[PDB]
């Protein structure tokens, strides 16, 4: 029976019932979390998977195309970490750094940033497409400042 984000993707109309079952059974056989499997296999669009992830995982979701690039916090995360992981550092508030992730089940990436920054790291969902494009966009805007 169809549970988790697989069920939510059905209720959202993003995927067929039998495809959701087959994905779910496959992920279970691989011992891989459902959102990771769905992203890897591209069963639905990134924004659809982000939408189902947000409601089922209880997480906030940001359209970063409306974020003011000039307020990004990319420079708090080293170039190495930004290629090791596929995350989009967003914005700092006090001892908190909000980090865009597209997989609700990142741990290494958030913990690495936690150790590198000595900040408290809060994940915010951002769909996988936007993280790819926007990180590059924001690196270009940061570079225009110099260095």
């Amino acid at each position: 029976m169809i549970t988790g984000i697989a069920r939510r993707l059905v209720q959202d109309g993003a995927v067929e019932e039998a495809v959701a079952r087959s994905a779910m059974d496959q992920a279970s056989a691989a011992k891989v979390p459902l959102p990771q499997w769905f992203a890897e296999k591209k069963l639905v669009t990134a924004s659809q998977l982000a939408a189902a992830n947000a409601v089922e995982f209880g997480m906030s979701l940001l359209d970063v195309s409306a974020f003011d690039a000039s307020q990004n916090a990319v420079k708090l995360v080293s170039e190495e970490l930004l290629q090791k992981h596929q995350v989009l550092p967003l914005f700092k508030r006090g001892n908190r750094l909000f980090v865009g992730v597209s997989n609700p089940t990142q741990t290494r990436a958030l913990d690495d940033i936690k150790f590198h920054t000595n900040l408290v790291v809060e994940p915010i969902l951002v769909d996988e497409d936007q993280i790819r494009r926007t990180l590059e966009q924001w690196q270009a805007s940061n570079a225009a400042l110099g260095s």
């Binding site: 409601v55 209880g58 906030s60 979701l61 359209d63 409306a66 307020q71 914005f91 006090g94």
Partner: protein, 111 residues
């Protein structure tokens, strides 16, 4: 209220928690248990602390936090102010009221 949200902000702390300074054009967080999708067009009636005027904001959803979210984070939607004189006016009043408070360390409804 058939697709018309409303938000009344009675003091400066309420406005601080609601305001979204990193949104292009400005944005405002509106508590609601209804699930919205990023990109949805919404109409908001926004009351600010300085007066009883209800400000019409025809904006786009750029942020969602779901019902039963992980922590003490309120369910609702972040609404981008539209391009145009009506939107910039709203942003301008807000940024005056919160002067020196936006780079505060105090947590908001969003970030």
């Amino acid at each position: 209220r058939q697709g018309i949200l409303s938000l009344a902000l009675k003091d400066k702390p309420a406005l601080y928690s609601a305001y979204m300074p990193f949104v292009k054009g400005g944005g405002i967080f509106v508590p609601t248990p209804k699930r919205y999708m990023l990109g949805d067009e919404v109409f908001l009636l926004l009351t600010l602390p300085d007066s009883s005027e209800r400000l019409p904001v025809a904006g786009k959803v750029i942020w969602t936090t779901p019902a039963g979210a992980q922590g003490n984070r309120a369910a609702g939607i972040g609404v981008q102010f539209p391009d145009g004189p009506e939107g910039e006016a709203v942003r301008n009043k807000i940024e005056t009221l919160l002067a020196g408070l936006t780079t505060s360390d105090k947590p908001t409804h969003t970030m």
